[PDB]
Write a protein that binds this ligand. Structure first.
Ligand SMILES: Cc1cc2nc3c(=O)[nH]c(=O)nc-3n(C[C@H](O)[C@H](O)[C@H](O)COP(=O)(O)OP(=O)(O)OC[C@H]3O[C@@H](n4cnc5c(N)ncnc54)[C@H](O)[C@@H]3O)c2cc1C
Ligand SMILES: Cc1cc2nc3c(=O)[nH]c(=O)nc-3n(C[C@H](O)[C@H](O)[C@H](O)COP(=O)(O)OP(=O)(O)OC[C@H]3O[C@@H](n4cnc5c(N)ncnc54)[C@H](O)[C@@H]3O)c2cc1C
Lengths: 358, 358
């Protein structure tokens, strides 16, 4: 019934962060609608997965803990950990949501959003809600890319310890693929990795991988290979490539293949989704519906992929301000200045240009 | 002979960083005078010591790698490491010094600085130099606190592996003391730690310490003890405390006791050094001599201890600007704005107030 100012779809990193930022800009009539519980995606990381980005409570001197979604919070503070488990990060989001008294509705699958006269109407599996501004914060963890007949996606592994010691193949040479190799190899398995790469790799994964290898771990990498299909016959898996002889392997291959936000129905209803790409204005706004915005790790602008918390969280306050100006309210320059001083006001993508001189 | 604009005493983290920042503000007639080689202190860390602060190349999106001493550099970039060895950090400072073409004079022990009419005169063991502005960047690693008859200071250990497996005592329950315990315990020794503390500890050291302990390591901590003296008699070391029965131990105790910058002759000549405290103006300037400043980890203001790279490096550009204004040159607002945007313009200590809400 209520004519809410804001509805945020999804109570993940981006939705919780955005709700806190909106509060700082004086916007409190905000509901968050979540299909599972706060931090759903993080709770479904494999058990051993840790953030590659390290948490340190540098919050006082100009940059908040890189994994924090608000200026005054820090997983390193709450948990005394540097590399955070998904389970711990879910709890971080719960601790922060409880503290800032966010109005969140769990176990509510948003099914349809449409325009009415005075607001947007939000159909869910629970009840209907209404709001002026919508922040689509739905991510993509539930839409992993599974292009072949077989293969276990990284996102569907509960615990790499459940795999018996043996011979495994990993497809995708990225952060998750090398993590998969490292998790399996640390338990004594032999891994073959096929990739479309160690040069793009974060220090955390690079050092962990290098240490098990330096200690004799058997991890091999084949570097100019693209998988055509995976089939199962004659008691084993057969990986066929575009250019190259097929390969056979005893256990199901692990796919570190990525995800696709355009597969989300809500994204399809609210944005132009031309080609696995979500079209947004320079203010992260839908080009179809006004006052509908996209937030989180799925925001790409080909001036920045925004896939890290420390990147996508810098947009929150830029949108909160825009919202206050469209509402005819004065600019909250005390607040805008805190965000700017703490690296959380990315208003110009021209200066996201990341490159070191040596 | 030359009437230099600037002389920086010390080519450590702070001296190299300050020279690069001065260059960005258009001040290039800068000499750096170093008693050893670039990064001398780091080269004399114990071999196993790593920065507790993690390096990640976040440089593009508003905060440079926390261990970097300039905006456009990153040990994570150059070395693909997160927790940096002292040896690697020395090389980082050398790579950056070579790239920015700093004018550095190694193996030059500065012995005396005094006022002349048109500039300051700098007596060294090599030759005499002259400069308008002096940045005292001498640190304190060579003045460890050794208050007892015996004890091996943490800073004088080359390699914790050289200690035979056995029974050790560590005095001081801080980052270095817990590192000492962890290094010895990981090689199977039993450690007794005496402290004036795990709550102040960084995530990196907390997790490493907790892991060896969880794996059965024998590390014990006695928490309300102050060492009076250490003596050696009857084949062993005797630790006597203010309040408490003495203790006896077979090997020389390891002191994680800290350092004292006021023991440096150059600091004594240029600052009021009342009580292990160095008196500075709100612009890090000497209260005795104008245009003489203190930079680095030794700058404390009881509004901030500035003992971390990410803290003390934020003062560089504030001083560089002050210098340009005293020179009657226009404010370089392009530069001032880069520094401000990258968390490296700490002009007001009132906002160094570090405290998380949860
Ligand atoms: C394995 C892995 C490791 C990562 N490691 C790092 C790291 O080291 N550092 C870093 O900065 N980032 C990391 N990330 C990247 C990024 O931070 C995460 O993807 C993060 O989850 C992005 O946050 P989000 O809010 O955009 O999405 P999510 O956290 O996925 O939140 C989306 C939420 O919306 C909900 N939802 C979806 N559809 C609906 C609907 N129809 N109705 C209601 N609710 C819905 C979901 O249940 C979910 O909780 C990692 C990601 C992955 C997958
Ligand atoms: C063991 C240890 C671990 C640390 N870990 C971290 C970390 O995790 N993260 C972090 O941010 N900081 C860390 N630090 C804190 C701080 O960053 C270091 O102390 C750092 O060395 C400070 O840099 P500096 O330039 O002020 O001093 P220094 O690096 O010590 O530089 C001073 C230089 O001046 C030279 N010098 C001294 N006297 C003279 C003279 N008379 N004439 C010419 N040259 C002279 C010296 O040779 C030396 O090279 C750590 C420090 C120690 C001791």
């Amino acid at each position: 019934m209520q004519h809410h100012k804001v509805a945020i779809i999804g109570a993940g990193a981006a939705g919780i962060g955005m709700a806190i930022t909106l509060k700082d800009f004086g916007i409190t009539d905000v509901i968050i609608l979540e299909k599972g519980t706060v931090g759903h995606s993080f709770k479904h990381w494999p058990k051993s997965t840790r953030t590659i980005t390290p948490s340190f409570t540098s919050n006082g001197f100009g940059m908040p803990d890189m994994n924090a979604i608000s200026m005054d919070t820090s997983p390193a503070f709450t948990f005394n950990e540097e590399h955070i488990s998904g389970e711990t990060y879910a709890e971080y989001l719960q601790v922060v949501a409880n503290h800032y008294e966010l109005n969140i509705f769990e176990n509510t699958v948003v099914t349809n959003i449409s325009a009415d006269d005075a607001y947007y109407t939000i159909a869910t599996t629970t009840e209907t809600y209404h709001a002026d501004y919508i922040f689509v914060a739905t991510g993509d963890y539930n839409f992993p890319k599974k292009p072949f007949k077989y293969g276990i996606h990284y996102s569907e592994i509960e615990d790499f310890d459940n795999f018996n010691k043996g011979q495994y193949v990993v497809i995708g040479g990225n952060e998750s693929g090398f993590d998969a190799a490292y998790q399996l190899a640390k338990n004594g398995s032999d891994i073959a990795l096929y990739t479309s790469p160690s040069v793009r790799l974060s220090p955390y994964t690079r050092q962990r991988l290098g240490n098990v290898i330096k200690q004799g771990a058997r991890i091999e990498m084949n570097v100019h290979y693209t998988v055509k299909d995976i089939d199962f016959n004659n008691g084993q898996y057969h990986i066929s490539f575009d250019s190259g002889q097929s390969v056979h392997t005893p256990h199901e291959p692990i796919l570190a293949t990525g995800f696709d936000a355009t597969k989300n129905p809500i994204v399809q209803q609210l944005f132009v989704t031309t080609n696995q790409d979500i079209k947004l204005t320079t203010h992260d706004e839908s080009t179809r519906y006004p006052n509908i915005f996209m937030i989180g790790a799925t925001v790409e602008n080909d001036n920045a992929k925004l896939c890290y918390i420390y990147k996508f969280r810098a947009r929150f306050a830029v949108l909160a301000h825009l919202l206050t100006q469209r509402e005819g309210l004065p600019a909250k320059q005390e607040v805008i200045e805190n965000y700017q001083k703490n690296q959380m006001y990315l208003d110009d993508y021209s200066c996201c240009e990341v490159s070191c001189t040596c």
